[PDB]
Coordinates of N, CA, C and O in Angstrom, one line a residue:
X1 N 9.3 -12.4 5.5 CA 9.1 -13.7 4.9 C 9.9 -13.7 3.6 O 9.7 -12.9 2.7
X2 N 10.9 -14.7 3.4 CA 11.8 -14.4 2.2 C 11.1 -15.5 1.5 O 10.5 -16.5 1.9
X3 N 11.4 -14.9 -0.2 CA 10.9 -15.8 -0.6 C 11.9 -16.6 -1.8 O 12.7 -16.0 -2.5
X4 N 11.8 -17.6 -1.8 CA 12.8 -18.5 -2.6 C 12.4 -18.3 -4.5 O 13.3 -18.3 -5.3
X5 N 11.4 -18.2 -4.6 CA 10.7 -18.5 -5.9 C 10.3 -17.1 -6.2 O 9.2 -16.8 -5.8
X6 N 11.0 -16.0 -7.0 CA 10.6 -15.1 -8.1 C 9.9 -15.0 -8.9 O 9.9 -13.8 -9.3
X7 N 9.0 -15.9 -9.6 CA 8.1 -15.4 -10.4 C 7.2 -14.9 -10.9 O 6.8 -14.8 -12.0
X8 N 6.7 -14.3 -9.6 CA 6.5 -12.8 -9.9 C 6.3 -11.8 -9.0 O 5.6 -11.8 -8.0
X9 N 7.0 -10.6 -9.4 CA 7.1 -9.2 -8.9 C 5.8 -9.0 -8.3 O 4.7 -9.4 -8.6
X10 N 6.5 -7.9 -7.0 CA 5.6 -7.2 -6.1 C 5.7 -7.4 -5.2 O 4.9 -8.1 -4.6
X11 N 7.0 -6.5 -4.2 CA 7.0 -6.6 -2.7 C 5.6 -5.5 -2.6 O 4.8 -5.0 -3.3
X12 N 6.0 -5.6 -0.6 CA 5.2 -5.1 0.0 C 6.0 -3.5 0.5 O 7.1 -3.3 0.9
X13 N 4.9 -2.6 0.2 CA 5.1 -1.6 0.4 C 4.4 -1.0 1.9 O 3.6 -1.5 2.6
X14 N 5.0 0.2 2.2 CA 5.0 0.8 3.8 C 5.3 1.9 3.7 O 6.2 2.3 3.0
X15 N 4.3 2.9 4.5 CA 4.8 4.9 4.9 C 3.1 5.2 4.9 O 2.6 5.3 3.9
X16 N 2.5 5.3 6.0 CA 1.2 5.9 5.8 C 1.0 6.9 6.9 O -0.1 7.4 7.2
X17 N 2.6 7.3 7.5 CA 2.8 8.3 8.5 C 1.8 8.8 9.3 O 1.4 9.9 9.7
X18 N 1.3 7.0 9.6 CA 0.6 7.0 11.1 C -0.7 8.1 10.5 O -1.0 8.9 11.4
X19 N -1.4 8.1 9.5 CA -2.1 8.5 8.9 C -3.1 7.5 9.0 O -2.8 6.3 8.8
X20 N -4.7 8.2 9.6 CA -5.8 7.2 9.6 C -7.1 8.1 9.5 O -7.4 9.0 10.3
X21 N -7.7 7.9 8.4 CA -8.5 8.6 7.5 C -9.8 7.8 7.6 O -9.7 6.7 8.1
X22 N -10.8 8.2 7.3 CA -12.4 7.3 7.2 C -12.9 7.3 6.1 O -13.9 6.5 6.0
X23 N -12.3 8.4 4.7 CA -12.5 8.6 3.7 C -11.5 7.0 2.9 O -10.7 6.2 3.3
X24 N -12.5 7.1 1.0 CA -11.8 6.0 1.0 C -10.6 6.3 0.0 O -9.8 5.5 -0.4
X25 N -10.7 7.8 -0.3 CA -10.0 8.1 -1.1 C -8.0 8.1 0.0 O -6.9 8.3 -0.6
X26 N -8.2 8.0 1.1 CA -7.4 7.7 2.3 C -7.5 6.6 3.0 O -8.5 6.2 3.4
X27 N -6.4 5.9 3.0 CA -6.3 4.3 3.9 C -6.6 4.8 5.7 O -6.3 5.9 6.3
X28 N -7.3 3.8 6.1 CA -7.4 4.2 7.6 C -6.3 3.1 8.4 O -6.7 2.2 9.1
X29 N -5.0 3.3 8.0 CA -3.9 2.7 8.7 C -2.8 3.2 9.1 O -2.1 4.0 8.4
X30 N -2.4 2.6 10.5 CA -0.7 3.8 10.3 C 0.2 2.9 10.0 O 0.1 1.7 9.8
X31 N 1.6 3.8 9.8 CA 3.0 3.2 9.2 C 3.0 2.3 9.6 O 2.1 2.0 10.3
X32 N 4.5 0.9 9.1 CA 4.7 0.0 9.9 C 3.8 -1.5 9.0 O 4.2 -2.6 8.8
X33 N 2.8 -1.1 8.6 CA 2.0 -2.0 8.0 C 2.1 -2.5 6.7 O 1.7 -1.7 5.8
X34 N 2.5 -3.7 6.2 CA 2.6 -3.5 4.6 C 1.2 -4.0 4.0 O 0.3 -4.7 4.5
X35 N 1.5 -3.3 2.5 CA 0.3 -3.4 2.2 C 1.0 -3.7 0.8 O 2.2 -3.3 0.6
X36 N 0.0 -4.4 -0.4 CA 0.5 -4.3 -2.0 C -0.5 -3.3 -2.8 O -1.5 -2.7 -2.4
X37 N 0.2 -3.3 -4.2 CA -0.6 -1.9 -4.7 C -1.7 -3.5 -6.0 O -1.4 -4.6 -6.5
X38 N -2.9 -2.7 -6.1 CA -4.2 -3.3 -6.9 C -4.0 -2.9 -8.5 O -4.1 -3.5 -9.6
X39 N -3.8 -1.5 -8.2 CA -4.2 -0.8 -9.9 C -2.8 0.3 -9.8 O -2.4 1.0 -8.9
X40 N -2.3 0.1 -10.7 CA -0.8 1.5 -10.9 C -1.5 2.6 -12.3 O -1.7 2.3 -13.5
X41 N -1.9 3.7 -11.7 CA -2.5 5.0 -12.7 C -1.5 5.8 -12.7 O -0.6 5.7 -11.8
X42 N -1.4 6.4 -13.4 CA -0.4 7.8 -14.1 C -0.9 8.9 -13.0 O -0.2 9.9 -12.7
X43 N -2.0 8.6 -12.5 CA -2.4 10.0 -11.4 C -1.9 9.6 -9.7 O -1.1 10.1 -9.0
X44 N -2.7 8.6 -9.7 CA -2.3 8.0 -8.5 C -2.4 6.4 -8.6 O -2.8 5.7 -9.5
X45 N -1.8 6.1 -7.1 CA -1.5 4.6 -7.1 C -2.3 4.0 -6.0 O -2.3 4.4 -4.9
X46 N -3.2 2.8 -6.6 CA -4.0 1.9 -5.7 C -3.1 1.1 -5.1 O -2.1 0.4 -5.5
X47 N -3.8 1.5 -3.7 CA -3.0 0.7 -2.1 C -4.5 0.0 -1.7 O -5.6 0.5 -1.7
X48 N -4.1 -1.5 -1.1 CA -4.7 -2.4 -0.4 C -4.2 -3.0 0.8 O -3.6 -4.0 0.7
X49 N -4.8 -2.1 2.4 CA -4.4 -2.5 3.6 C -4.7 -4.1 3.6 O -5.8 -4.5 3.2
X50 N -3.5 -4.9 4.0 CA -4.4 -6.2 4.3 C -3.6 -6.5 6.0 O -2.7 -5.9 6.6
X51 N -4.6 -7.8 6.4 CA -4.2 -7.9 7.8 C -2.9 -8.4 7.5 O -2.3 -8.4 6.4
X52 N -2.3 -9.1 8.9 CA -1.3 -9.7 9.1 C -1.5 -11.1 8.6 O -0.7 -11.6 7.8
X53 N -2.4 -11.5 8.9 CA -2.3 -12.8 7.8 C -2.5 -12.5 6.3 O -2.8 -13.5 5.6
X54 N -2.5 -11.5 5.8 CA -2.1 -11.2 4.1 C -3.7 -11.3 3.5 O -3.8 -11.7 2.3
X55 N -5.2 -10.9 4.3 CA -6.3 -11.3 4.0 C -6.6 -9.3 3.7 O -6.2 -8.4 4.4
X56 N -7.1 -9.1 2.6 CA -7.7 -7.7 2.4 C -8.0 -7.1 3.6 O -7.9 -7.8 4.6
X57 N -8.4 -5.6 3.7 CA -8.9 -5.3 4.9 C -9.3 -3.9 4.9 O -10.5 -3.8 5.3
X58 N -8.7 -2.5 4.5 CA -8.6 -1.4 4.0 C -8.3 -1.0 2.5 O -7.4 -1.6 2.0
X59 N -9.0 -0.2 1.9 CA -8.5 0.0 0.2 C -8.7 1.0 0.2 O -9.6 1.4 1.0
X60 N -8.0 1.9 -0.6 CA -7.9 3.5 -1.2 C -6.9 3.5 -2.0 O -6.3 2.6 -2.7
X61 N -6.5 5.0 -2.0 CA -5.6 5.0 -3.2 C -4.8 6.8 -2.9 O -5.4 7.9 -2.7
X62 N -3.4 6.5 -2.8 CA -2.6 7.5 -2.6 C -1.0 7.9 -3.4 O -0.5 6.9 -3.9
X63 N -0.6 8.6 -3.4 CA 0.5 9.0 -4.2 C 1.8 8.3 -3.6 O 1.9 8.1 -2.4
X64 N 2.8 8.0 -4.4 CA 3.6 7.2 -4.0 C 4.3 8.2 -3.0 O 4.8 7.7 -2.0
X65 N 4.3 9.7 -3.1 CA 4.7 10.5 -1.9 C 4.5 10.2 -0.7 O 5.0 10.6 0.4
X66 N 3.3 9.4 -1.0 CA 3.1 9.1 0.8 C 4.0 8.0 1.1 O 5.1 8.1 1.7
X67 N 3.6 6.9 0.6 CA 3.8 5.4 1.2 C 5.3 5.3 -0.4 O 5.3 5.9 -1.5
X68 N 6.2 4.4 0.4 CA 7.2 4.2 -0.1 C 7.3 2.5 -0.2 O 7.0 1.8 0.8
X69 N 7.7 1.9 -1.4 CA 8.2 1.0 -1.4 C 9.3 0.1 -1.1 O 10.4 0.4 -1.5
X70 N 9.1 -0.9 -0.5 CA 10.0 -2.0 0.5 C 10.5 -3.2 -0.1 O 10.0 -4.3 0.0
X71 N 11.9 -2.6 -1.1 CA 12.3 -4.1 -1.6 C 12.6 -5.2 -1.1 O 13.4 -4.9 -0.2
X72 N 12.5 -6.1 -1.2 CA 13.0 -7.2 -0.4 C 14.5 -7.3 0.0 O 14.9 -8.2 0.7

């Protein structure tokens, strides 16, 4: 989905290497899926699975080592 209007930052990011956890400190989603980050910490970084229609769905929180971000 491109978007015409910039104002303001925050693609969607992707890499959960088919990783599916039940814990919440772990997203229960695999790769392929984008998701946006909630909270950015100096330790780790909050990730929020949402569906395909862009509605919440999954939340945890993982190191950017995992999941890589998807510039437009």
């Amino acid at each position: 989905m491109v978007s015409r209007d910039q104002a303001h930052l925050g693609p969607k990011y992707v890499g959960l290497w088919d990783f599916k956890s039940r814990t919440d400190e772990e997203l229960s989603f695999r790769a392929g899926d984008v998701f946006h980050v909630a909270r950015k910490e100096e330790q780790w970084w909050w990730a929020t699975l949402l569906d395909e229609a862009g509605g919440a769905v999954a939340q945890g929180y993982v190191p950017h080592n995992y999941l890589a971000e998807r510039e437009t």
